[PDB]
């Protein structure tokens, strides 16, 4: 059990029972944070990476461009590092010194953007510099990379199977990307046959999930839970397979990672407080009482210590 | 697999094989950031707290009070939420904001220590406030509490031995409290039997364990090597099992992580780069050329933002 690279080790984190959450241990939490570059965004990288390989169209020699400085940037500049391509990704010029500082220290050239243009500035940057020689550059997309799904369904929901020994009959998960809920739900529901419930979580400040299936007007808004309600529906969110959906404000979710923290020694960013939170809701309906609730916790405290978190 | 809290979640790290250090792929990496509170003293954290519970020396309503914010004091602060103690860390007022926010935010009192004492001030005053109602406060004593080296015993030696097949030939670890070199040495040699290479790392600056085997004038110094380099033989460091000691300076330590995280894509901290340099070093004699050493990573990245490091 000695992995070649680094990108290879990906996955096979623990499940932690809650004890001041849910009710007789029913809400149980996937520490994601455990992982290469300490995200749930390390299976993407690496398999976003493993998949534009296999079919080509990533090479010896050519080169990544993401725009992204978040989860997804560092876990794409820890493969690219670990597998040796070059990486850019493209970001405000406004991004923290500390994520500079990470990924400049990761070996990614950074391509900073005005900062009056914001993260349109940063995409539009990444598909022109892609554009000026699309036989060099390659961009991997994941919000609509299949690669980025097709890995949760491949390791994180056989691995909440198999720790669980199939008794799970609840996946929480906040929505970025949608890959993680979709990815799991497949597993479970498709792959081993469980009729489980697949539970959506997103920001009530930004609630597009829920106008959305409710057939009401989409109207996204800022929120500071980092790394969920992207503002649109991604199209890795399959949401055939969801069968409910969460909304979670702000401060609650800051409360309850920093509760997480001081009252279940877990060291989780905003989004795992998210989740939980809605976790703890459906935990303490009658109707979910004799349930195994499993809540996917997306990353790390010390990633967030520059943040309200702290 | 369902852990009953986050202190029983530690361990089961994963071997990384170096790319760009050794020959012919003869250096492996263990990832120690990939625990509960990211580091490898969450096995001690936890495993210390457990041993005093069995033999009644921490029961429900006493708390614990410790000379520390390193790595240890983050362990110890995670395991007493995890487990429902109330913890008091001692430490100089002069430590980073950071690093108070991350203990105060994992719900640890914490009491600062006059500036001008240092470390120094922060153990006398854990003393102090033992002293005042020792029935009431416990210090578990990291750097001669013996369940510290017996948790890598039980646990970080067997993982190597079974990651490896058996076919580790030699370990590197830096010695803080000598914990990790001592239990992964008495397990591979004592319990499986193996003659392998037994090596400490410790800093060109304060090498005071190659002084002392070598009969000389014991000469501590200052180092920015974090975790490592205490300046003494703490009793956790059984000197019987080392077989060899490599001096390692700050610089090229420091050198050594970036490249870790620039050239494998590992986020390790600066102790790790300490490690592999000392191992890089062995690598490359003829003598180690047939031999896998295998190299103990004792944090993560993200951790040293604030530090040198980056």
């Given at each position: 059990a000695i992995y070649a690279d680094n990108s290879y080790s990906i996955g096979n984190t623990p499940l932690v029972r809650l004890?001041?959450?849910?009710?007789?241990?029913n809400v149980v939490v996937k520490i994601?944070?455990?992982?290469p570059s300490y995200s749930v965004k390390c299976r993407i990288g690496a398999n976003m990476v493993w998949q534009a390989e296999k079919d080509g169209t990533?090479?010896?020699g050519k080169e990544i461009v993401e725009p992204t400085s978040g989860n997804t940037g560092i876990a794409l500049a820890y493969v690219a590092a670990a597998r040796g391509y070059k990486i850019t990704l493209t970001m405000?010029?406004?991004?923290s010194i500390e994520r500079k500082r990470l990924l400049c220290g990761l070996g990614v050239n950074l391509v900073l953007t005005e900062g009056a243009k914001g993260m349109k500035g940063a995409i539009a940057k990444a598909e022109e510099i892609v554009a000026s020689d699309p036989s060099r550059y390659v961009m991997l997309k994941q919000f609509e990379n299949p690669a980025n799904p097709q890995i949760h369904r491949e390791t994180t929901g056989p691995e909440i199977w198999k720790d669980t020994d199939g008794k799970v009959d609840v996946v929480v998960a906040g929505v970025g990307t949608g890959g993680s809920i979709t990815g799991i739900s497949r597993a479970i529901?498709?792959?081993?046959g469980k009729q489980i419930t697949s539970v959506a979580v997103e920001p009530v400040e930004s609630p597009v999930i829920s106008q959305t299936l409710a057939g009401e007007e989409v109207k996204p808004g800022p929120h500071?839970?980092?790394?969920?309600?992207?503002?649109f529906i991604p199209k890795?969110?399959?949401?055939?397979?969801?069968?409910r959906v969460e909304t979670v404000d702000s401060d609650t979710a800051l409360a309850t990672a920093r509760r997480l923290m001081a009252e279940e020694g877990i060291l989780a960013g905003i989004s795992s407080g998210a989740a939980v939170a809605a976790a703890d809701r459906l935990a303490k309906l009658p109707e979910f009482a004799d349930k195994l609730i499993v809540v996917i916790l997306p990353s790390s405290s010390e990633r967030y210590l520059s943040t309200a978190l702290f």
């Open positions: 004890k001041h959450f849910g009710h007789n241990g994601e944070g455990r992982n990533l090479t010896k405000p010029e406004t991004m529901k498709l792959d081993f500071k839970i980092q790394g969920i309600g992207a503002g890795n969110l399959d949401l055939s397979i969801i069968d």
